[PDB]
Design an enzyme around this catalytic site. Structure first.
Site, PDB file in Angstrom:
ATOM      1  N   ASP A   2      40.539  37.820  40.607  1.00 35.13           N
ATOM      2  CA  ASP A   2      40.747  38.255  39.218  1.00 35.13           C
ATOM      3  C   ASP A   2      39.714  37.690  38.247  1.00 35.13           C
ATOM      4  O   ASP A   2      40.051  37.243  37.151  1.00 35.13           O
ATOM      5  CB  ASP A   2      42.155  37.898  38.737  1.00 35.13           C
TER       6      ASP A   2
ATOM      7  N   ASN B 236      45.408  32.156  40.273  1.00 38.00           N
ATOM      8  CA  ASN B 236      44.342  33.070  40.667  1.00 38.00           C
ATOM      9  C   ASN B 236      43.509  32.532  41.818  1.00 38.00           C
ATOM     10  O   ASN B 236      42.354  32.927  41.988  1.00 38.00           O
ATOM     11  CB  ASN B 236      43.446  33.387  39.467  1.00 38.00           C
TER      12      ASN B 236
END
Ligand SMILES: CN1CCC(c2ccc(-c3ccc4c(c3)C(=O)N([C@@H](C(=O)Nc3nccs3)c3cc(F)ccc3O)C4)cc2)CC1
Ligand SMILES: CN1CCC(c2ccc(-c3ccc4c(c3)C(=O)N([C@@H](C(=O)Nc3nccs3)c3cc(F)ccc3O)C4)cc2)CC1
Ligand SMILES: */C=C/C(=O)Nc1cc(Nc2nccc(-c3cn(C)c4ccccc34)n2)c(OC)cc1N(C)CCN(C)C
Ligand SMILES: C=CC(=O)Nc1cc(Nc2nccc(-c3cn(C)c4ccccc34)n2)c(OC)cc1N(C)CCN(C)C
Lengths: 291, 291
Positions: free
Chosen positions: B155, B142
Site C-alpha cells: 500500500d 501495511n
C-alpha cells in the site's frame, strides 16, 4: 540431510483422497504449523504397509535422496512422518496431472503447449539422469501440472506398468536411463493422443510378444512423422540406439519453435500460449521459482 | 506495461472480508482462470468510491508503476478489473499483517525475529527510495507476513497523524525522510508488540507535543542502543534522521547479536528456524529468491 523434515502426526491432516499409487494412496491434506493459525494445502502419500525400524531405514535414506533434487521440472520430497504407517508429504499441484489434464482439455490443447510439455519432461528426466536417478515409472499420470506452462515429474526412483516398460525391463528386470527413454516415448504417445490407453485391449501378459515381433504404438493422428520417428526410436530394442534425454530436449525445442509444422490440430490457430502478461500473472500467484 | 494484467469480472470473485483501509475494502478472493477448474487465492481491494473512465486512466497510470516493483520485501500489484468500482489484485499473504501477528504472538517472539523484521522493512523502504517511490503510509498494518521469516511492504504510492513526521502534519511535506519517521513508529509498534502509539492523546494535539520535544516512550524490552535509533528517526531536522541504507546496516549488526540489544523474558528457548524448517517453509510458501 537438512532437506527432509520429519513431521508429527499432529501437524498435518489428510482431508480428501486424490488417488492410489501402486504402493499407497495419495491424499489432499493441510499443514498446520506448530504455534500458528494458518493451514497450507499439501499432498500426503500414506504407504500400504510395513512400519519396521529396518524398512524405515531404507525408506528414510531413500527419502533423503528424493529430498535432494533441485530442478524446476522435478518434484522434491519435502517431509516424512515415521509412525505405524509411513506418510510422505510433497507440494500440492492444484492443476492435477498432465494425464487427466489432456483428457479433460482435449478440445483446447494447442500444439505449442504439447511440444513444450515434451521438452519440460525431457529436462526433468535429463536432470535425473545427471543425478544418476532412474525413474522406473514415467507415465503421463506421474507428470504433475504446477501451471499449464510448467509441468514437473514426480514419483521417480521408487523401485507393474507393463505397457510403459522397455522390453529389457519386462523380460529381465533391467531399469536404465535408456529404459526410461522407452517410457518417455509412451508418455509422449499419451500426450499426443490426449490420454489414450496404450495397447488398448491387449492383456499385459501379452506385450512382450508383440514387441518382439515388431509391433509398436500407432502414429497418433495429430503427429507428423518427425514426431512419430522420435517416438519410434525411443522403442528400439537396442537401448543405446534410443535417443538420450539431452538430444530429446534439443529436438522437441526446435519443433516448439514451429509447432503447427510438427503437430496437426484442428483449429490450432485459435488456441495459443499465454502472453507475457498472462505468464507473469501465473508466476506471481503460483510459480515463483526460477524456470 | 506487461506486468499489470487486466482482468475480467468473470474470472475472480470475493469470498471474505479481510479488512478495510481508507481507499477501500480488502477481500480474500479466488481467481478462476478462464477455461480451467482450479481456484487460486488472491487479495482483492475494491475501491469503495465508484469512479469514471476519466478517473480510471489516473488509476491505471499509477497501477502500472505499482506493478513495476521487483524486490522481495515489497508487494507487487498483479492485476486490475475496471468495472463501476475498480478492483485491485495482489498475492494473498496467509499469515496476515505484522501488527496483528506480533499482537497475537506477544512474548512468544524472540529478539531474532524482531530485528530481522526491522531489517527487512528497511530493505523494502530503501528499494522504494531507489525507485524514487515515497510510501506515505508506513505502519505495522501495511507490513504483510508471507512467512514469519519474510515480511513485505504494501500500500505505497499515492490521516495517520500518529505515524507522520512533523513537517507532514504542519506542511504536508512527504519526503523519504518523512518515511523514516514513520518507520521509527513502526519499529516502535513491533518492539511494544502492537501498542497504540501516543495512546489516549487526541490526534489534533500530536503536533503540539512533538514541537515540545515529547516522543514515544522506550519500550521495556529495548535497550538504549535501539531506542536511540528510533529517537533519531524523530529528529525535527529531516537531514539529521538516518538513511534507510544506514538502518539496514545498523539493525543488521544488532541482529548478529540479538540478546545484546533486546532483553525478552524466556528469549533463549525461542529461536529462528533451522535450514530444514526454512527449506520446508520456502518450498511450500516462499519460492521467491530473497537474501
Ligand atoms: C521390504 N521392503 C519394504 C519396503 C521398502 C521401501 C523402501 C522405500 C520406500 C519409499 C521411499 C521414498 C519415497 C517413496 C517410497 C515414494 O513413493 N516417494 C514419492 C512420494 O511420496 N510422492 C507423493 N505424492 C503425494 C504425497 S508424497 C516421491 C516424491 C518426490 F517428491 C520425489 C520423488 C518421489 O519418489 C518417495 C518404500 C518402501 C523396501 C523393502
Ligand atoms: C478523486 N479520486 C479519483 C480517482 C484517483 C485514484 C488514483 C489512483 C488509485 C490507485 C492506484 C493503484 C493502487 C492503489 C490506488 C492502491 O491502493 N494499491 C495497493 C493495493 O492494491 N493493495 C491491495 N490489497 C489487497 C488486494 S490489492 C498496492 C498494491 C501493491 F502490490 C503495491 C503497491 C500498492 O499501493 C495500488 C485510486 C484512485 C484519485 C482521486
Ligand atoms: C492425475 C491424478 C490425480 O489424482 N491428480 C490430481 C492431483 C492433485 N495434486 C497432486 N499434487 C501432488 C502430488 C499428486 C500425486 C502424486 N501421486 C503419485 C499421485 C497419485 C495419485 C493421485 C495424486 C498423486 N497430486 C490434485 O490436487 C487437488 C488433484 C488431482 N485430481 C484431478 C483428482 C480429482 N479429485 C479432487 C477427486
Ligand atoms: C493486518 C490486517 C491484515 O492484513 N489482515 C489479514 C490479511 C491477509 N492477507 C492479505 N494479503 C494481502 C494484502 C492484504 C491487505 C492489504 N491491505 C491494504 C489490507 C487492509 C486490511 C486487511 C488486509 C489487507 N491482506 C490475511 O490472509 C488470510 C489475513 C488477515 N487477517 C489477520 C485476518 C484475521 N485472522 C486472525 C482471522
Amino acid at each position: 540431510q537438512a532437506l527432509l523434515r520429519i513431521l508429527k502426526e499432529t501437524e498435518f491432516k489428510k482431508i480428501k483422497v486424490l488417488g492410489s499409487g501402486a504402493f499407497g494412496t495419495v491424499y489432499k491434506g493441510l499443514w498446520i504449523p506448530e504455534g500458528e493459525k494458518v493451514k497450507i494445502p499439501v499432498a500426503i502419500k500414506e504407504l500400504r504397509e510395513a512400519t519396521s525400524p529396518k524398512a524405515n531405514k531404507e525408506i528414510l535414506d531413500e527419502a533423503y535422496v528424493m529430498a535432494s533434487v533441485d530442478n524446476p521440472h522435478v518434484c522434491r520430497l519435502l517431509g516424512i512422518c515415521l509412525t505405524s504407517t509411513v506418510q510422505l508429504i510433497t507440494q500440492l499441484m492444484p492443476f492435477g496431472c498432465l494425464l487427466d489434464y489432456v483428457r479433460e482439455h482435449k478440445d483446447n490443447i494447442g500444439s505449442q503447449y504439447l511440444l513444450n510439455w515434451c521438452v519440460q519432461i525431457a529436462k526433468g528426466m535429463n536432470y535425473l539422469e545427471d543425478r544418476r536417478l532412474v525413474h522406473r515409472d514415467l507415465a503421463a499420470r506421474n507428470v504433475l501440472v504446477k501451471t499449464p506452462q510448467h509441468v514437473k515429474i514426480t514419483d521417480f526412483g521408487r523401485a507393474v506398468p507393463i505397457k510403459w516398460m522397455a522390453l529389457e525391463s519386462i523380460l529381465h528386470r533391467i531399469y536404465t536411463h535408456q529404459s526410461d527413454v522407452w517410457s518417455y516415448g509412451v508418455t509422449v504417445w499419451e500426450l499426443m493422443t490426449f490420454g489414450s490407453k496404450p495397447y488398448d485391449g491387449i492383456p499385459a501378459s501379452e506385450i512382450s510378444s508383440i514387441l518382439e515381433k515388431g509391433e509398436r504404438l500407432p502414429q497418433p493422428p495429430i503427429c507428423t512423422i518427425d514426431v512419430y520417428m522420435i517416438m519410434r526410436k525411443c522403442w528400439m530394442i537396442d537401448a543405446d540406439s534410443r535417443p538420450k534425454f539431452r538430444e530429446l530436449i534439443i529436438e522437441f525445442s526446435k519443433m516448439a519453435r514451429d509447432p503447427q509444422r510438427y503437430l496437426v490440430i484442428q483449429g490450432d490457430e485459435r488456441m495459443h500460449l499465454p502472453s507475457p502478461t498472462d505468464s507473469n500473472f501465473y508466476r506471481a500467484l503460483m510459480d515463483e521459482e526460477d524456470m
